[PDB]
């Protein structure tokens, strides 16, 4: 169930950055969605109490998160130049690699 | 979402006893239908309408979705997603406007006898109530299900799962679940009362040697429809109340009170109604007691 709160914590945060204006709300968004990511990333899902680390359903939901972390720090870079749009047009396509990648382990 | 393989395996074994008790149930009932003639009464077609929806639940409602609370992913496609929302939504709002049919037709017998006496063997009247309630039934959640995504620019429903497009419009939700919850529970409370005051009624009721001993005789018969009517209305309200009031607590707390699990749960409590029923018919009518003898022991002549 923490990784039921971080996952919590992922969508509270997106939906700030849609009804955002400036980059530091923005980005106060991306760096606790980040801290939940990582957070959530070392959790091992209820489907998966009985999995190795190595096997290819942990190191895929791993990668589902590596795609959202690395996506996050997109959005970060374009939020730590001031670049609000930019920035806030990047978190939608944290919903696509959400759902393709990592709600199937929820 | 889902499961380990430890879990699954329980879980599965449990499933499939609930599928198998709910379809051998109802179709055990519907084969009684086949076996007595005598069965041909408004009221047996009332508790038939019941067997088809249960019998529904058993092979087509609760198999489609094992596989998505055992796994967490439904994989059937949307379209197939939206013909079992719609077959889930009807069933459920079916089983209850059809409880409430049941009690009108049990409060018409008691509390207008006579007129009931004549109307009772017409089945094309009682084949027509319960179209016309497989239609309203449908109305509730048909076309909000099959329309709503179109009606809001497209989908907030990810490929993974399988929900009612309206199942996070706190609005839509707040307005069914009230209507889905108090039209049936008013309506089923109010015949029932309605059925006791009258037997209490002419229970103190002073009458001759012969009209006063026709009417202890009427009485027994009339108290036994009650319990019949309680027993059935109670064990459905205990099945479906849960899942029908803590939908109108979801929609009134915006989903902030209610954790998803304990809706998931009631969905269980709900369906293994369905497996119910088929039992309840035999324990507490006669007419179903002797067309199981017609079928399965027909011995007794
Ligand atoms: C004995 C047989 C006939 C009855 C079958 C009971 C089985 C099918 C019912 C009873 C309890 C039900 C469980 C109760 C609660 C939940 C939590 C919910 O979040 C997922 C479904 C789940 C896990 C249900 C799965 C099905 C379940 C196990
Ligand atoms: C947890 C896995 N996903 C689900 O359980 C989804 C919740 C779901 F949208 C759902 C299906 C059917 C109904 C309606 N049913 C009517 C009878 C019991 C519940 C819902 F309220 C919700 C299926």
Redesign the pocket.
């Given at each position: 169930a923490d990784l039921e709160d971080n996952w919590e914590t992922l969508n509270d945060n997106l939906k700030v950055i849609e009804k955002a204006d400036n980059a530091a709300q923005v980005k106060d968004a991306l760096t606790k969605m980040r801290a939940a990511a990582l957070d959530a990333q070392k959790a091992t899902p209820p489907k998966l109490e009985d999995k190795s680390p190595d096997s290819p359903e942990m190191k895929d939901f791993r990668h589902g998160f590596d795609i959202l972390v690395g996506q996050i720090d997109d959005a970060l870079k374009l939020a730590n130049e001031g670049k609000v749009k930019e920035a806030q047009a990047a978190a939608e396509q944290l919903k696509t690699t959400r759902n393709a990648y990592i709600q199937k382990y929820l | 979402?889902g499961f380990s393989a430890a879990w699954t395996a329980v879980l599965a074994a449990l499933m499939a006893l609930l599928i198998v008790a709910t379809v051998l149930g109802n179709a055990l009932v519907m084969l009684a239908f086949v076996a007595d003639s005598s069965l041909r009464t408004q009221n047996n077609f009332f508790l038939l309408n019941l067997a088809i929806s249960d019998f529904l639940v058993g092979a087509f409602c609760i198999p489609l979705?094992v596989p998505?609370?055992l796994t967490?992913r439904w994989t059937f496609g949307r379209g197939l997603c939206k013909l079992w929302?719609v077959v889930?939504?009807l069933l459920?709002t079916s089983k209850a406007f059809n409880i409430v049919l049941i009690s009108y037709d049990r409060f018409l017998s008691v509390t207008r006898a006579v007129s009931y006496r004549a109307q009772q063997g017409d089945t094309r009247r009682a084949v027509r109530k319960m179209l016309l309630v497989w239609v309203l039934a449908f109305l509730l959640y048909g076309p909000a299900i099959l329309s709503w995504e179109y009606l809001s620019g497209g989908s907030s429903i990810p490929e993974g799962?399988?929900?009612?497009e309206f199942?996070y419009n706190w609005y839509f939700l707040i307005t069914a679940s009230t209507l889905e919850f108090f039209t049936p529970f008013l309506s089923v409370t109010f015949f029932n009362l309605s059925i006791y005051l009258n037997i209490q009624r002419r229970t103190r009721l002073r009458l001759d040697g012969a009209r006063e001993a026709a009417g202890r005789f009427r009485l027994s018969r009339d108290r036994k429809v009650a319990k019949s009517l309680a027993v059935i209305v109670s064990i459905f309200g205990l099945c479906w109340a849960p899942?029908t009031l803590l939908?109108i607590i979801r929609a009134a707390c915006h989903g902030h009170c209610v954790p998803?699990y304990w809706?998931?749960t009631s969905?269980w409590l709900?369906?293994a109604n369905s497996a119910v029923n088929p039992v309840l018919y035999p324990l507490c009518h006669h007419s179903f007691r002797r067309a199981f003898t017609k079928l399965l022991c027909p011995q007794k002549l």
């Open positions: - | 979402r979705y998505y609370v967490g929302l889930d939504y459920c799962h399988c929900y009612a199942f899942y939908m998803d809706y998931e969905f709900l369906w």
